[PDB]
Write an enzyme that holds these catalytic residues in place. Structure first.
Site, PDB file in Angstrom:
ATOM      1  N   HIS A   1     -36.662 -16.174  12.391  1.00 36.74           N
ATOM      2  CA  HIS A   1     -37.692 -17.186  12.605  1.00 36.74           C
ATOM      3  C   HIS A   1     -39.054 -16.599  12.708  1.00 36.74           C
ATOM      4  O   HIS A   1     -39.250 -15.536  13.285  1.00 36.74           O
ATOM      5  CB  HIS A   1     -37.477 -17.936  13.920  1.00 36.74           C
ATOM      6  CG  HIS A   1     -36.138 -18.593  14.054  1.00 36.74           C
ATOM      7  ND1 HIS A   1     -35.477 -18.634  15.262  1.00 36.74           N
ATOM      8  CD2 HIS A   1     -35.336 -19.206  13.148  1.00 36.74           C
ATOM      9  CE1 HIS A   1     -34.318 -19.262  15.086  1.00 36.74           C
ATOM     10  NE2 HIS A   1     -34.211 -19.623  13.813  1.00 36.74           N
TER      11      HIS A   1
ATOM     12  N   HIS B   1     -41.996 -17.372  14.964  1.00 40.65           N
ATOM     13  CA  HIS B   1     -42.377 -18.044  16.213  1.00 40.65           C
ATOM     14  C   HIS B   1     -43.915 -18.111  16.299  1.00 40.65           C
ATOM     15  O   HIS B   1     -44.658 -17.358  15.653  1.00 40.65           O
ATOM     16  CB  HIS B   1     -41.767 -17.326  17.433  1.00 40.65           C
ATOM     17  CG  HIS B   1     -40.300 -17.577  17.614  1.00 40.65           C
ATOM     18  ND1 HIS B   1     -39.823 -18.317  18.673  1.00 40.65           N
ATOM     19  CD2 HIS B   1     -39.226 -17.255  16.859  1.00 40.65           C
ATOM     20  CE1 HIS B   1     -38.503 -18.381  18.588  1.00 40.65           C
ATOM     21  NE2 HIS B   1     -38.125 -17.775  17.486  1.00 40.65           N
TER      22      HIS B   1
ATOM     23  N   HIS C   1     -40.701 -22.132  17.631  1.00 41.42           N
ATOM     24  CA  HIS C   1     -40.827 -21.932  16.211  1.00 41.42           C
ATOM     25  C   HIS C   1     -42.193 -22.439  15.732  1.00 41.42           C
ATOM     26  O   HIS C   1     -42.676 -23.496  16.174  1.00 41.42           O
ATOM     27  CB  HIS C   1     -39.716 -22.676  15.439  1.00 41.42           C
ATOM     28  CG  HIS C   1     -38.338 -22.222  15.779  1.00 41.42           C
ATOM     29  ND1 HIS C   1     -37.215 -22.676  15.123  1.00 41.42           N
ATOM     30  CD2 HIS C   1     -37.901 -21.347  16.715  1.00 41.42           C
ATOM     31  CE1 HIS C   1     -36.144 -22.114  15.661  1.00 41.42           C
ATOM     32  NE2 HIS C   1     -36.536 -21.294  16.621  1.00 41.42           N
TER      33      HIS C   1
ATOM     34  N   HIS D   1     -36.338 -28.989  13.559  1.00 37.97           N
ATOM     35  CA  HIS D   1     -35.735 -27.754  13.020  1.00 37.97           C
ATOM     36  C   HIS D   1     -34.807 -28.068  11.858  1.00 37.97           C
ATOM     37  O   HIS D   1     -34.076 -29.091  11.863  1.00 37.97           O
ATOM     38  CB  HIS D   1     -34.989 -27.040  14.110  1.00 37.97           C
ATOM     39  CG  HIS D   1     -34.387 -25.750  13.679  1.00 37.97           C
ATOM     40  ND1 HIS D   1     -35.117 -24.583  13.580  1.00 37.97           N
ATOM     41  CD2 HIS D   1     -33.106 -25.428  13.356  1.00 37.97           C
ATOM     42  CE1 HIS D   1     -34.328 -23.618  13.143  1.00 37.97           C
ATOM     43  NE2 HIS D   1     -33.094 -24.097  13.021  1.00 37.97           N
TER      44      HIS D   1
ATOM     45  N   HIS E   1     -39.157 -26.629  10.371  1.00 40.33           N
ATOM     46  CA  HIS E   1     -40.334 -25.935  10.834  1.00 40.33           C
ATOM     47  C   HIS E   1     -40.849 -24.971   9.784  1.00 40.33           C
ATOM     48  O   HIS E   1     -40.064 -24.398   9.004  1.00 40.33           O
ATOM     49  CB  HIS E   1     -39.970 -25.119  12.069  1.00 40.33           C
ATOM     50  CG  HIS E   1     -39.456 -25.944  13.195  1.00 40.33           C
ATOM     51  ND1 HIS E   1     -38.488 -25.491  14.061  1.00 40.33           N
ATOM     52  CD2 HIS E   1     -39.803 -27.187  13.615  1.00 40.33           C
ATOM     53  CE1 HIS E   1     -38.277 -26.418  14.983  1.00 40.33           C
ATOM     54  NE2 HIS E   1     -39.042 -27.463  14.716  1.00 40.33           N
TER      55      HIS E   1
ATOM     56  N   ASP F   1     -38.830 -21.679   9.846  1.00 40.47           N
ATOM     57  CA  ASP F   1     -37.396 -21.700   9.679  1.00 40.47           C
ATOM     58  C   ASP F   1     -36.934 -20.978   8.400  1.00 40.47           C
ATOM     59  O   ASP F   1     -36.689 -21.589   7.347  1.00 40.47           O
ATOM     60  CB  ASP F   1     -36.894 -23.145   9.674  1.00 40.47           C
ATOM     61  CG  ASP F   1     -37.025 -23.813  10.994  1.00 40.47           C
ATOM     62  OD1 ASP F   1     -37.238 -23.122  12.029  1.00 40.47           O
ATOM     63  OD2 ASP F   1     -36.948 -25.067  11.076  1.00 40.47           O
TER      64      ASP F   1
ATOM     65  N   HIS G   1     -32.302 -12.885  15.643  1.00 44.37           N
ATOM     66  CA  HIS G   1     -31.523 -13.480  16.729  1.00 44.37           C
ATOM     67  C   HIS G   1     -30.065 -12.972  16.813  1.00 44.37           C
ATOM     68  O   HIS G   1     -29.489 -12.420  15.885  1.00 44.37           O
ATOM     69  CB  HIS G   1     -31.511 -15.002  16.554  1.00 44.37           C
ATOM     70  CG  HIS G   1     -32.731 -15.688  17.073  1.00 44.37           C
ATOM     71  ND1 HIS G   1     -32.835 -16.152  18.360  1.00 44.37           N
ATOM     72  CD2 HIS G   1     -33.886 -16.017  16.458  1.00 44.37           C
ATOM     73  CE1 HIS G   1     -34.014 -16.721  18.526  1.00 44.37           C
ATOM     74  NE2 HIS G   1     -34.678 -16.645  17.391  1.00 44.37           N
TER      75      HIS G   1
ATOM     76  N   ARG H   1     -33.136 -13.493  21.529  1.00 46.08           N
ATOM     77  CA  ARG H   1     -34.119 -12.866  20.637  1.00 46.08           C
ATOM     78  C   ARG H   1     -33.874 -11.381  20.722  1.00 46.08           C
ATOM     79  O   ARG H   1     -34.266 -10.736  21.722  1.00 46.08           O
ATOM     80  CB  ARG H   1     -35.536 -13.240  21.056  1.00 46.08           C
ATOM     81  CG  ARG H   1     -35.794 -14.710  21.021  1.00 46.08           C
ATOM     82  CD  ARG H   1     -37.222 -15.107  21.424  1.00 46.08           C
ATOM     83  NE  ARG H   1     -37.320 -16.550  21.455  1.00 46.08           N
ATOM     84  CZ  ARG H   1     -38.380 -17.235  21.853  1.00 46.08           C
ATOM     85  NH1 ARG H   1     -39.487 -16.641  22.291  1.00 46.08           N
ATOM     86  NH2 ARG H   1     -38.342 -18.568  21.856  1.00 46.08           N
TER      87      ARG H   1
END
Ligand SMILES: [Cu+2]
Ligand SMILES: [Cu+2]
Ligand SMILES: [Zn+2]
Ligand SMILES: [Zn+2]
Ligand SMILES: [Zn+2]
Ligand SMILES: [Zn+2]
Lengths: 153, 153
Positions: free
Chosen positions: B46, B48, B63, B71, B80, B83, B120, B143
């Site tokens: 992602h 962020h 995100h 999402h 997003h 994403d 992740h 994370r």
């Protein structure tokens, strides 16, 4: 307003967090925070061109300098955009950074977001050292710690 | 062309280097590089919102999502901006990342420079997990590593 932040780290003990805040487009940018692990005295403090720390601080490129000008002090007309005031570490190795600079920006052509902040071994000579490297880098010696400048909430 | 780069670090195990290239404004961005230290299989990946590493990856915020959308998977209209496709780690814990994404950008409203790339613990469920957190984060767990996306030469 726009805000940014940078975590400085390196291979020795130097580490710090530096905050940036700009109330409006083209306005002064406040730069403040603390860096520890420094030798007592003055230390060069620059925005370098690239936010590339793949080879540590070495990959950050030269001083941020979109018009290919000579290195100067922060109060000079002829300076790189990245030429910030030297920071001062006290006897305990701590620099309590407090700068206002209207040449850097958090938007536009002088935007430093996504670039690298670096704190140096030695004082920056403000481009007045009388040699070619003074006019390019300020002779501030090694790059002790650095980080990429990120957007903050 | 615009280029960017991101060094992913966490607390030891997971490390990587991810490159970005966008040949033209409003064009696709190529995302490629290597991440090591992962468990075999799929891992969420992602952009962020904040380039803020002051509290490790936890300070990166949600995100990147400028229009407050739900999402989704990278091929969904409703996603997003941040994403990205899950990355795949091999049997030795290495993900050889190779993505082309036309929603992220290196300029404009979808600019990711100065934001945080995060890898992740688990696979992103593509917003199809049937719960509210699915529609927010993809349920990708912790994370593992992150970095600020910097301008590259
Ligand atoms: Cu410097
Ligand atoms: Cu994420
Ligand atoms: Zn004003
Ligand atoms: Zn200029
Ligand atoms: Zn300079
Ligand atoms: Zn998302």
């Amino acid at each position: 307003a726009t805000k940014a932040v940078c975590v400085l780290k390196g291979d020795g003990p130097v580490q710090g967090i530096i905050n940036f805040e700009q109330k409006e487009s083209n306005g002064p940018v406040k730069v403040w925070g603390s860096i520890k692990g420094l030798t007592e005295g003055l230390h060069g403090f620059h925005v370098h061109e690239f936010g590339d720390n793949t080879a540590g601080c070495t990959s950050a490129g030269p001083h941020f300098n979109p018009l290919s000008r000579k290195h100067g002090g922060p109060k000079d007309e002829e300076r790189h955009v990245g030429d910030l005031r030297n920071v001062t570490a006290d006897k305990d190795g701590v620099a309590d950074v407090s700068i206002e600079d209207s040449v850097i920006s958090l938007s536009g052509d002088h935007c430093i977001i996504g670039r690298t902040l670096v704190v140096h071994e030695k004082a920056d000579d403000l481009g007045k050292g009388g040699n070619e490297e003074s006019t390019k880098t300020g002779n501030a010696g090694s790059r002790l710690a650095c980080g990429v400048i990120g957007i903050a909430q």
